Ligand binder design. Structure first.
Ligand SMILES: [Cl-]
Ligand SMILES: [Cl-]
Lengths: 170, 168
């Protein structure tokens, strides 16, 4: 069982590898279930958050604990876009991720982005398409992105995003 | 238009949803709310057996609740999903009498020989948790407690809660 060592803010994790494309493997980054690794990552991103930031924006599911911890550390709230419509979801902003994934933001969350300086947060950024979709949702709700952050950078994103580590493709 | 629920002194005026005809209930949501989640976590904390070694919850809203509680107690936790996800490793699959739960093999191995505590935001019939308890058994773990912040009616399962959700 092959593992690859990834490190963030002093905390190291030997993680399995996944092959999203033939012969192109990447370490599996998972913050879910891991408070210590999540804390290290949230603390590494914290200094990258603009002092003007008013709310965080992330997508389910793995990024949730990371964003929650960062938000509480910053004393800010945050919102979560879902990857599918959920029962009782209210008049959601639906945004297609340019291929396909579709993001859903409950109206209750959207109302919280109005006139707010938003910071997009993800665990990993690759092409940047997910964040482009997230930003459009921000604009549609009446606010705007003052910063885009992700813990890991995979390859070279087609969008400007601040990251703290590189995720190697093996 | 909104109904007020309180936990640990933190009050939230939440919307109402109708899980059944003419029966509305407060919509408790911890996602996006660190303060409310913190109050709920500290409220659940005293209900956690001292033998507990790992927490077990299901996506999605209970995740931040469980994460905060876990970090406070210095424990790890695992999360069951409500649908198979890409690259999922030989998962434990369990059906709910009411939904199918999926537990990644990497998470199941964390439960082996461990004392487990089930955590949720809201408990009603108690089925989701029964499904979760079976997954723990198959993972070779043992449940020592079942916790939820809110109780909705009377559960057909023994679950410790902090407050009740009225049926309006
Ligand atoms: Cl995910
Ligand atoms: Cl949910």
């Amino acid at each position: 069982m092959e593992t690859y060592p990834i490190t963030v803010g002093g905390v190291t994790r030997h993680v399995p590898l996944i092959e999203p494309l033939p012969g192109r493997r990447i370490p599996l980054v998972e913050f879910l279930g891991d408070p210590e690794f999540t804390r290290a990552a949230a603390e590494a991103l914290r200094p990258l958050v603009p002092k003007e930031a008013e709310i965080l924006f992330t997508t389910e599911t793995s990024p949730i604990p990371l964003t929650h911890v960062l938000a509480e550390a910053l004393g800010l709230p945050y919102v979560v876009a879902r990857r599918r419509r959920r029962p009782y979801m209210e008049d959601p902003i639906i945004q297609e991720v340019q291929t396909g994934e579709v993001l859903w933001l409950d109206r209750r969350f959207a109302e919280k982005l109005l006139n707010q300086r938003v910071v997009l947060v993800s665990d990993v950024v690759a092409s940047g398409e997910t964040m482009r979709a997230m930003e459009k949702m921000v604009l549609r709700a009446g606010g705007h992105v003052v910063a885009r952050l992700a813990v890991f950078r995979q390859g070279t994103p087609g969008l400007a995003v601040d990251t703290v580590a590189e995720l190697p493709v093996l």
